[PDB]
Amino acid sequence: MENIQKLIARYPLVEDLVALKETTWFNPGATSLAQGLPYVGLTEQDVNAAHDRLARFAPYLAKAFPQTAAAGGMIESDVVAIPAMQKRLEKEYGQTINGEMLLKKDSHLAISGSIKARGGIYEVLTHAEKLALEAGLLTTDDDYSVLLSPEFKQFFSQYSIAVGSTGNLGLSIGIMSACIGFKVTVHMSADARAWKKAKLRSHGVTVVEYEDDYGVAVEQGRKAAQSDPNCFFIDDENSRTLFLGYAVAGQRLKAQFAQQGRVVDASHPLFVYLPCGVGGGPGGVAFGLKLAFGDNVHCFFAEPTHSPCMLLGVYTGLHDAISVQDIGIDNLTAADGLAVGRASGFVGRAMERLLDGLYTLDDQTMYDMLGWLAQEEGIRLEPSALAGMAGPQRICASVAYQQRHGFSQTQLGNATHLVWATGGGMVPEDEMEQYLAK
Ligand code: NA
């Protein structure tokens, strides 16, 4: 009634969300690592176990994917300085980026060039391990390169994987599963991009299309998998296994910074800008980053103006009890990996205290910056992977965010701004030329 409209008036940013206006929200309740940790429900030991499991699978990956052999079967991406892009952004948008801007190239991760691959590949491998252990065919002391044998491939070919996805997660699962031996079915909305559907279908992956949203595709994926004990559902909304897979990135990045001699501390703060779809990818990475760098890393989520599911969920405190469609937002965006109308739930509650803020940007901003990055640095990405690129200027422009955290412009001169590129390596020439044309 009158109280319901009094309640809504307490959440004025929702008006801007409905109006599709680019905005930024800084979390007034962002906490220390210690204060936020209990809400995650996962520990550093859980992350260490993920690291250990990837090291067990490293001989397998080195043999199966020889491009990783020099790194010993580790799947990791470059981190590069992008100073020409930094200057271009300053020219185009008229806001100084204090400090130094870098790009984390998960767009070019080996085997499958996406942030989602960190989790997808990890989950597939974790699941294969579980099946082999419980069949009494493997122990954690065995050399996991044995799993590449025709015998083990045959064993795994008895099983299937089901997954609801916008595209990239399915691609990474399909690629790893083909090697392991699993059959795959990807459940996806009709809204998903044609080229990602075609790429799965051309590689022996079953695609089930739904005349509904991503959320329905995931739920119908769940139901289909329940019928068959040999079918395993990878749950993009709920999987802690995916989450931990992404979290591996934290210590990897710290090691890279250590190699590059790059300092992160109170006087050299690290800011990280993460594209957000359902929240699993950016949430997991953020968790790993927080464990690695503590209170000196400051994480932000970036969403399309047409799909601000996580910002809406966190800002209202409703999380997954509300969707963007609930308030008239169409969930239609060129950032197809981020076209998720309802936030994870578990990520929202687990990670909100560990996020300094969340912001939105338009498709045109993503397209413009996509072109500029190619022009300035020679790096070609998909639209979703540009969501974090708007971040450094949102932060450097906000005097009041700097007020809240005891920063200044002078202090930010010592800052590192890390834009997390989430996809681009798997994009065909025809599709990339279309993105460059806007
Ligand atoms: Na989203």
The DSSP secondary-structure symbol of 101 reads E
What are residue 63's phi and psi, to 5 degrees? Answer: -80, -45
Site of tokens 């409905």: 18
d(CA 158, CA 123): 18
Per-residue tokens: 47: 């992350």
Q: How many CB atoms lie within 10 A of CB 372?
A: 18
d(CA 33, CA 273): 18
Distance between Cα 324 and ligand 1 center (Å): 9
Report helix, strand or coil for 183.
strand
Per-residue tokens: 224: 């289909």
Distance between Cα 138 and ligand 1 center (Å): 40
d(CA 168, CA 195): 11
For residue 200, give every residue at least 6 positions away whose Cβ sits within 8 Å of its Cβ, in sequence order, or none: 170, 171, 174, 186, 207
Distance between Cα 293 and ligand 1 center (Å): 26
Report helix, strand or coil for 207.
strand
Task: Record the resolution, in angstroms.
Answer: 1.9
Distance between Cα 346 and ligand 1 center (Å): 14
Do 363 and 386 contact (CB within 8 A), yes or no?
Answer: no
Do 16 and 358 contact (CB within 8 A), yes or no?
Answer: no
Distance between Cα 406 and ligand 1 center (Å): 30
d(CA 115, CA 104): 10
For residue 287, give every residue at least 6 positions away whose Cβ sits within 8 Å of its Cβ, in sequence order, or none: 40, 42, 47, 243, 246, 247, 250, 350, 351, 354
d(CA 163, CA 233): 6
Find the Cα–Cα–Cα–Cα dihedral 359, 404, 397, 411, rounded to 10°.
-130
Distance between Cα 348 and ligand 1 center (Å): 12
d(CA 282, CA 272): 10
d(CA 328, CA 19): 9
Per-residue tokens: 367: 């397209």
Question: Positive or negative CA dihedral for 62, 67, 70, 72?
Answer: negative
User: How far does Cα 75 stand from its chain's mean position?
Assistant: 16
User: How far does Cα 343 stand from its chain's mean position?
Assistant: 13
Amino acid of residue 160: S
By DSSP bridging, strand 206-210 and strand 183-189 are: parallel
CA distances from 287 to 91, 249, 384 (A): 33, 9, 21
Do 217 and 210 contact (CB within 8 A), yes or no?
Answer: yes
Do 169 and 205 contact (CB within 8 A), yes or no?
Answer: no
Distance between Cα 309 and ligand 1 center (Å): 5
Distance between Cα 142 and ligand 1 center (Å): 41
User: What's the burial of 74, exposed, middle or buried (CB within 10 Å: 0-12/13-18/19+)?
Assistant: middle
Question: CA nearest 271: which of 49, 56, 26, 57?
Answer: 26
Do 363 and 306 contact (CB within 8 A), yes or no?
Answer: yes
CA distances from 190 to 213, 317, 366 (A): 8, 30, 22
By DSSP bridging, strand 160-164 and strand 270-275 are: unpaired
Distance between Cα 169 and ligand 1 center (Å): 15
d(CA 20, CA 22): 7
* Rg of the chain taking only CA atoms, in angstroms: 21
Report helix, strand or coil for 126.
helix
Q: First CA to last CA across the chain, in angstroms?
A: 45
CA distances from 44 to 53, 239, 248, 298, 302 (A): 14, 17, 10, 18, 25
Per-residue tokens: 297: 């890393």
Distance between Cα 327 and ligand 1 center (Å): 14
The DSSP secondary-structure symbol of 278 reads S
Do 161 and 127 contact (CB within 8 A), yes or no?
Answer: yes
Site of tokens 């993920």: 50
d(CA 187, CA 127): 19
Distance between Cα 306 and ligand 1 center (Å): 8
Where are the alpha helices (H) located in 388-428, listed in sequence order? Answer: 391-397, 399-404, 409-412
Distance between Cα 116 and ligand 1 center (Å): 14
By DSSP bridging, strand 100-105 and strand 79-81 are: antiparallel
Question: Positive or negative CA dihedral for 395, 396, 397, 402?
Answer: positive
Query: Strand 270-275's sheet: what is its strand order?
Result: 24-26, 357-361, 297-304, 270-275, 416-421, 100-105, 79-81
d(CA 200, CA 25): 37
Report helix, strand or coil for 43.
coil
Amino acid of residue 186: V
What are residue 206's phi and psi, to 5 degrees? Answer: -80, 130
For residue 435, give every residue at least 6 positions away whose Cβ sits within 8 Å of its Cβ, in sequence order, or none: 367, 370, 382, 383, 427
Distance between Cα 47 and ligand 1 center (Å): 25
Name all contacts of 59-62 with Cβ < 8 Å and 24+ positions apart. Answer: 59/143, 59/144, 59/145, 60/125, 60/144, 60/145, 60/147, 60/148, 61/111, 62/145
CA distances from 402 to 252, 263, 398, 408 (A): 28, 20, 7, 6
CA distances from 253 to 55, 139, 248 (A): 17, 30, 9
Site of tokens 């509300």: 322
Do 168 and 114 contact (CB within 8 A), yes or no?
Answer: yes
CA distances from 320 to 77, 156, 169, 232, 343 (A): 31, 35, 20, 24, 5
d(CA 319, CA 419): 25
Distance between Cα 328 and ligand 1 center (Å): 15
- How many residues appear in the chain? 438
Amino acid of residue 270: L
Do 421 and 122 contact (CB within 8 A), yes or no?
Answer: no
Domains and CATH numbers, the chain: 2-113+237-438 (3.40.50.1100), 114-236 (3.40.50.1100)
d(CA 329, CA 327): 6
By DSSP bridging, strand 297-304 and strand 270-275 are: parallel
Distance between Cα 230 and ligand 1 center (Å): 32
Find the Cα–Cα–Cα–Cα dihedral 131, 43, 402, 99, rounded to 10°.
-60
Distance between Cα 316 and ligand 1 center (Å): 15
Distance between Cα 234 and ligand 1 center (Å): 19
**How many Cα atoms are found within 13 Å in the side-chain-facing hemisphere of 270?**
25
Distance between Cα 304 and ligand 1 center (Å): 7
Site of tokens 């799909």: 307
Per-residue tokens: 135: 């069949």
Report helix, strand or coil for 23.
coil
User: What's the burial of 204, exposed, middle or buried (CB within 10 Å: 0-12/13-18/19+)?
Assistant: exposed
Distance between Cα 305 and ligand 1 center (Å): 9
Distance between Cα 274 and ligand 1 center (Å): 11
d(CA 111, CA 168): 12
Do 272 and 254 contact (CB within 8 A), yes or no?
Answer: no
d(CA 350, CA 217): 24
Distance between Cα 163 and ligand 1 center (Å): 18
Question: CA nearest 40: which of 265, 272, 287?
Answer: 287
Per-residue tokens: 181: 């031996």
Do 249 and 288 contact (CB within 8 A), yes or no?
Answer: yes
The DSSP secondary-structure symbol of 279 reads S
For residue 175, give every residue at least 6 positions away whose Cβ sits within 8 Å of its Cβ, in sequence order, or none: 111, 112, 121, 203
